Structures are given as C-alpha cells and as structure tokens.
C-alpha cells in the first residue's frame, strides 16, 4: 500500500460511520462473521494529541461486541500505528470528509470503504475499487442499506 | 448477456476456477457455502448437453446441464439453476453464472492468474448485484477444493 491521503485533517473525520465494503489479502480474514478482519467501524474519534481512536463492532459468542482501538500518529499524517504483538498500521487512502473514507489495516492487509450515511454510495465504491487496484486482495464484501443499519 | 454462437465441443476439457462472485455473501463465504464449487472439467454430451465435473467441500460431483431453446443457456431438477455462459475465447477463459440469487465464475485453461480473464470477469460483473468476490492463487488452483 503506497497511496496514502496527502493533507489529511483527522479533526474533519470525527463522527459515526458505516462499513459499506471490505477487502482482505486472505479469504480467511473476512469469510466468517467471526473472521479476524470482520470488524464494523461505528465511530472515528480523533484525540487532541492527533491520535485516531476507532469504535468497532465485532460478532463475538453470538452477539455484537464493541471494541476501541487507538491508532497513534506518526511523522506521516495519513499513517497511524496500532500497538499490538505485531505492528499494525492504519493507512488512510482517501476521504472527502462529508461522505466517504477509505483506509487499510496493514500487518496481511484488510481495507474498508466507510460512509457517513447508511446508503450504498456507488461513487465511494468506485473510489474503493480504484484504490484497491494492484493490492493482493482475494476477498471483497459489500453490504445493502438494511445490513448497514443492523448491529454487525 | 450470453455468449453468441457458443461451441460446446470447443469448451470441452480441463478448467480451473480462478475467481467467483455472488449476489449474497452467504452463497460463497464458507468452504461449505452453496455456490462454493470448483469446476475441474466441461464435457459435451451427444444430445448437446454440458457435463460439469466439480469439487465441493473434498467431494467430486458430475452435473449434467441440459440444453434449452436459448443458445449458451443450460438447466441443472430439485433446486433448479440456469447456467448462463457469458463469454469464452475457448483457449484461455470462460465466464458463466449459476442463476436461481446469482453466482458467477471466471474459469481458465491453466492454473495461472490471467489478467485478461479477470478484466473480462470484472466488466461482466459491473452491472450485476454482486456482494462477495473471491480469487485464488495458482497454488490453490492445483489443490483439492482450493
């Protein structure tokens, strides 16, 4: 992954979002409701220090569990580091702030198309497909408006 | 949009499932999902039907798709699916769909990633209600049930 957003201002991404589409380097990252990269973004919360907190939903033991991840700022404004056993980077590819945001979790690679409103946005999905060009993706999922409003 | 003038003697032989897509995530998500089937071979029958030799999670299955009045449209009796051949160049790639829900595949003649085949599959899928897409590496193409 090399296309990160030039000039990102995370103070303009705060609020509630919907995971519209998802793609991963391995089928087993996304295939099951319980698969590792199968996490729905509920909220983005930039911190005053310029870190990016994610509020996630995960299907866990047959219900929808909430999880908080803190992605710490780096020298590069569109690149954040998650403290974990192995370094996990968050790469923000693109956003127009008002409608859609595209990002990737990189160890294995899992990317998402987020939208502000729970409707299918064909422009956002076209931009997601362009940004995914040449990434080693083996699985892609997209959700209908019904699924966007449902827990997980 | 089905393959005009399909020649079933020319599609005969060995194939590999390179990519697949489906209208519903649950048709392809699990190794045992209903549309999760790997095409190993197509044979014509003398009656002009098309035999598919498939692997499914790893069981082998032989399915006869009966000709219909429409060229390149076959039928496979209890859970009736139409088989729609979208396009093939015979020598490299074949694109087809199972329609009741819709599950489509990109087949290639050799167990290698083919740029043209995947581009033609993506084009064909552009105006279809797909919600899941899978692609396999060459290692998986040579293995039982990928």
Swiss-Prot record, chain B:
Its main location: secreted. Keywords: Allergen, Disulfide bond, Milk protein, Retinol-binding, Secreted, Signal, Transport. Disulfide bonds join 58-145, 97-104, 97-106. It comes from the Eukaryota. InterPro entries: Blactoglobulin (IPR002447), Calycin (IPR012674), Lipocalin (IPR002345), Lipocalin_CS (IPR022272), Lipocln_cytosolic_FA-bd_dom (IPR000566). CDD domains: lipocalin_beta-LG-like. It holds the Pfam family Lipocalin. Alternate disulfide bonds occur in equal amounts in all variants examined. One of its GO terms (molecular function) is identical protein binding. GO terms for cellular component: extracellular region. SUPFAM superfamilies: Lipocalins. Synthesized in mammary gland and secreted in milk. It is found in: Secreted. Belongs to the calycin superfamily. Lipocalin family. Primary component of whey, it binds retinol and is probably involved in the transport of that molecule. Under physiological conditions beta-lactoglobulin exists as an equilibrium mixture of monomeric and dimeric forms. Interaction with LMBR1L which mediates the endocytosis of LGB has been observed in PubMed:17991420, but not in PubMed:23964685. This is Beta-lactoglobulin.
């Amino acid at each position: 992954v090399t296309q990160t957003m030039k000039g990102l201002d995370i103070q303009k991404v705060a609020g509630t979002w919907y995971s519209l589409a998802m793609a991963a380097s391995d089928i087993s990252l996304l295939d099951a409701q319980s698969a590792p990269a199968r996490v729905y973004v509920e909220e983005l919360k930039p911190t005053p220090e310029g870190d990016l907190e994610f509020l996630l939903q995960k299907w866990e033991n047959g219900e929808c569990a909430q999880k908080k991840i803190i992605a710490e700022k780096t020298k590069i404004p569109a690149v954040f580091k998650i403290d974990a056993l192995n370094e996990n980077k968050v790469l923000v590819l693109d956003t127009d702030y008002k409608k859609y945001l595209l990002f990737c979790f990189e160890n294995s690679l899992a990317c998402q198309c987020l939208v502000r409103t729970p409707e299918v946005d064909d422009e956002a999905l076209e931009k997601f497909d362009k940004a995914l060009k040449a990434l080693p993706m083996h699985i892609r999922l997209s959700f209908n408006p019904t699924q966007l409003e449902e827990q997980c």
